[PDB]
Scaffold this active site. Structure first.
Site, PDB file in Angstrom:
ATOM      1  N   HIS B  41       0.892  -1.636  -0.368  1.00 50.88           N
ATOM      2  CA  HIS B  41      -0.124   0.151  -0.524  1.00 50.88           C
ATOM      3  C   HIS B  41       0.589   1.269  -0.393  1.00 50.88           C
ATOM      4  O   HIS B  41       0.661   2.729  -0.549  1.00 50.88           O
ATOM      5  CB  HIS B  41      -1.125  -0.324   0.868  1.00 50.88           C
ATOM      6  CG  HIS B  41      -0.653   0.486   2.176  1.00 50.88           C
ATOM      7  ND1 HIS B  41      -0.925  -0.769   3.722  1.00 50.88           N
ATOM      8  CD2 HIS B  41       0.073   0.941   2.582  1.00 50.88           C
ATOM      9  CE1 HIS B  41      -0.433  -0.548   4.613  1.00 50.88           C
ATOM     10  NE2 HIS B  41       0.253   1.078   4.150  1.00 50.88           N
ATOM     11  N   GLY B 143       2.156   6.793   9.912  1.00 57.24           N
ATOM     12  CA  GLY B 143       3.621   6.484   9.700  1.00 57.24           C
ATOM     13  C   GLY B 143       4.876   4.732   9.924  1.00 57.24           C
ATOM     14  O   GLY B 143       5.613   4.485   9.507  1.00 57.24           O
ATOM     15  N   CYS B 145       3.615   1.815   9.127  1.00 54.87           N
ATOM     16  CA  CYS B 145       3.616   0.820   8.890  1.00 54.87           C
ATOM     17  C   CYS B 145       4.440   0.535   7.566  1.00 54.87           C
ATOM     18  O   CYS B 145       5.869   1.041   7.823  1.00 54.87           O
ATOM     19  CB  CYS B 145       2.368   1.114   7.792  1.00 54.87           C
ATOM     20  SG  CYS B 145       0.683   1.342   7.511  1.00 54.87           S
TER      21      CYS B 145
HETATM   22  C1  LIG Z   1      -5.985   5.905   4.420  1.00 56.37           C
HETATM   23  O1  LIG Z   1      -5.001   4.891   4.731  1.00 56.37           O
HETATM   24  C2  LIG Z   1      -5.378   3.210   4.653  1.00 56.37           C
HETATM   25  C3  LIG Z   1      -6.941   2.805   4.884  1.00 56.37           C
HETATM   26  C4  LIG Z   1      -7.020   1.903   5.117  1.00 56.37           C
HETATM   27  C5  LIG Z   1      -5.721   0.940   4.797  1.00 56.37           C
HETATM   28  C6  LIG Z   1      -4.778   1.512   5.686  1.00 56.37           C
HETATM   29  C7  LIG Z   1      -4.354   3.027   4.787  1.00 56.37           C
HETATM   30  O2  LIG Z   1      -3.322   3.230   4.989  1.00 56.37           O
HETATM   31  C8  LIG Z   1      -2.432   2.559   6.130  1.00 56.37           C
HETATM   32  C9  LIG Z   1      -2.892   3.308   6.891  1.00 56.37           C
HETATM   33  N1  LIG Z   1      -1.778   3.334   7.504  1.00 56.37           N
HETATM   34  C10 LIG Z   1      -1.115   3.998   9.259  1.00 56.37           C
HETATM   35  O3  LIG Z   1      -0.124   4.754   8.626  1.00 56.37           O
HETATM   36  C11 LIG Z   1      -1.802   3.371   9.910  1.00 56.37           C
HETATM   37  C12 LIG Z   1      -1.236   2.531  10.483  1.00 56.37           C
HETATM   38  C13 LIG Z   1      -2.118   2.254  12.269  1.00 56.37           C
HETATM   39  O4  LIG Z   1      -1.807   1.403  12.356  1.00 56.37           O
HETATM   40  N2  LIG Z   1      -2.543   3.832  12.385  1.00 56.37           N
HETATM   41  C14 LIG Z   1      -2.153   4.397  12.201  1.00 56.37           C
HETATM   42  C15 LIG Z   1      -3.240   5.370  12.733  1.00 56.37           C
HETATM   43  C16 LIG Z   1      -3.427   7.103  12.337  1.00 56.37           C
HETATM   44  C17 LIG Z   1      -3.090   7.380  11.674  1.00 56.37           C
HETATM   45  C18 LIG Z   1      -2.534   5.952  10.265  1.00 56.37           C
HETATM   46  C19 LIG Z   1      -2.142   4.919  10.441  1.00 56.37           C
HETATM   47  C20 LIG Z   1      -1.676   3.781   6.458  1.00 56.37           C
END
Ligand SMILES: COc1ccccc1OC1CN(C(=O)c2cc(=O)[nH]c3ccccc23)C1
Ligand SMILES: COc1ccccc1OC1CN(C(=O)c2cc(=O)[nH]c3ccccc23)C1
Lengths: 304, 304
Positions: B41, B143, B145
């Site tokens: 992703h 961030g 991931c």
């Molecule tokens: C809109 O993004 C997604 C939607 C569904 C699926 C994946 C998406 O992206 C990835 C998720 N991720 C993050 O950085 C993330 C991971 C996390 O465990 N906590 C978070 C808390 C607050 C903001 C972000 C995160 C990128």
């Protein structure tokens, strides 16, 4: 989201761990620059620990009696000295992995990470706090002495603890890196009982703010209190008195959640008086006090 | 003595963390030999995440669109491929800090350490478990991931998890290092609800053995039970069924304490039915299930 008891990454400290052997005793040492720091009780036999005269015992030891090993390689000891309850073994080689570092003496309520080691090898890392009675609730076995506690600010490791002993109650005592014990503890096998292990109120409040930030809000109530009213309850429950300094320290968490510090105090007051009623907060059935306000902000902001 | 939620020393894994940027998205990558593994992703915009066709999105990306940075230095990407839900970016330089490693797919109930990272930099380390519903209860922000879960056996790092997503309930989902998600989760922003988060019975029993080893014995009772009788209670309390395989796995802890596994089951049965009555076990007011029997033996023996 999510809130865990998180320790600092231990790599910078793993690169400093060495094994120190004196006679038949083996424990851990911390190698920074050309000095290896370790508990002075490395010179004792089990019989010596009952009433040791460290200055007298140390007279019978020369540089060649301190065997220092970093991985599978031996370090040459070219000097030794006692500073309070630690020995400083000067070696002929500076640790090439020496990180930027400071020696700090922490106050009760402050948290730190411990890298538990055996035979100079790291076994695990966990987070703990200097309790208000100057003990730590660690996880240490035979051979763990010389394991250290630290905090990291970007690339600087602030060492704050070196492990020395376990009291009969299963709690731990140790020194800062200048060899001064936290609290009244001494490196002797004698009757040493810990005082009241009060709860670190400011840390509980920080953790309640972490809970609100992470979605657990059932405990928020319609009340407020004053510092004096809250402290009457805190005293009754063996909680540390909350000061205006603590309220100021909670300012950023109050701003992030929009919950006034005294309103959070009133929620904590109700939790103390009514209990949890079989409910949990951040996966805990008790009020957690080993996260400082700085830890909560750090974890909730992602500082690396 | 003492029992803590202990993570593995993270140094070996810190040496593998890199930053991967594709377009405007930045996350973490794991650099082992000349390959950088990261969540696929990284190629998505927030709008793409609603219904992404990864194969189609990947066609618009070339090697030079994947910016990989290890510390302050850029790595040259000479190939890229998608394996399930991870991308493998072949770089022209083998990671000089590559530890001995394996990729393993863990089963529910197994624990591992997570090194939470942001922008390729480690922020903290914590211990967690693959839940019976294939989520983990981590601590991850924007961030995070590409942060990984691992276990260490002396000098070999067994990577078992790479972080991909957070469900609306605050729990986490991710893949093994072959890119296969644990559980039914998909890397799409869609309705994905977790199943029942049952309690890992064998881990609770291991932790009760840890409690006896560490002096907390108030919960030991005069009763015994059978696997079938215990399981009637376990089902009622959303605990995983205990099998003879679990009883065999608890053999060494039963031998160390002299407490038969079924007698410990009867103590756990009473704790489930009567509750804790305001008491604690190893500083917890709930029954802890994120220590495996192997973790208890490891912590109680000092394996490095
Ligand atoms: C809109 O993004 C997604 C939607 C569904 C699926 C994946 C998406 O992206 C990835 C998720 N991720 C993050 O950085 C993330 C991971 C996390 O465990 N906590 C978070 C808390 C607050 C903001 C972000 C995160 C990128
Ligand atoms: C008889 O030794 C002492 C007596 C009083 C004071 C110090 C003595 O020595 C040092 C203590 N220590 C250990 O290795 C140790 C530290 C620990 O935190 N837990 C343990 C659990 C089980 C066995 C040992 C330990 C060496």
């Amino acid at each position: 989201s999510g809130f865990r008891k998180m320790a600092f990454p231990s790599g910078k400290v793993e690169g400093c761990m060495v094994q120190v052997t004196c006679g038949t005793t083996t424990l851990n040492g911390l190698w920074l620059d050309d000095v290896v720091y370790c508990p002075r009780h490395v010179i004792c036999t089990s019989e010596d620990m009952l009433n040791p005269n460290y200055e007298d015992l140390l007279i019978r030891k020369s540089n060649h009696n301190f065997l220092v090993q970093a991985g599978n390689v031996q370090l040459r000891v070219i000097g030794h000295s006692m500073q309070n309850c630690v020995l400083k073994l000067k070696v002929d080689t500076a640790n090439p992995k020496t990180p930027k570092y400071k020696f700090v003496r922490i106050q009760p309520g402050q948290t730190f990470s411990v890298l538990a080691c055996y035979n100079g090898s790291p076994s695990g890392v966990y987070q703990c706090a200097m309790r208000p009675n100057f003990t730590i609730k660690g996880s240490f076995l035979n051979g763990s002495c010389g394991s250290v506690g630290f905090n990291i600010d970007y690339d600087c490791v602030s060492f704050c603890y070196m492990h020395h002993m376990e009291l009969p109650t299963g709690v731990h005592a140790g020194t800062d890196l200048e060899g001064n014990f936290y609290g009244p503890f001494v490196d002797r096998q004698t009757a040493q009982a810990a005082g009241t292990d009060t709860t670190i109120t400011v840390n509980v409040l920080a953790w309640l703010y972490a809970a609100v930030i992470n979605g657990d809000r059932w405990f928020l109530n319609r009340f407020t209190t004053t510092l004096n009213d809250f402290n009457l309850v805190a005293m009754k429950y063996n909680y540390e008195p909350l000061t205006q300094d603590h309220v100021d320290i909670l300012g950023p968490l109050s701003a992030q959640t929009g919950i006034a510090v005294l309103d959070m105090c009133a929620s904590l007051k109700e939790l103390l008086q009514n209990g949890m009623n079989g409910r949990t907060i951040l996966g805990s059935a008790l009020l957690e006090d080993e996260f400082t306000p700085f830890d909560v902000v750090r974890q909730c902001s992602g500082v690396t």
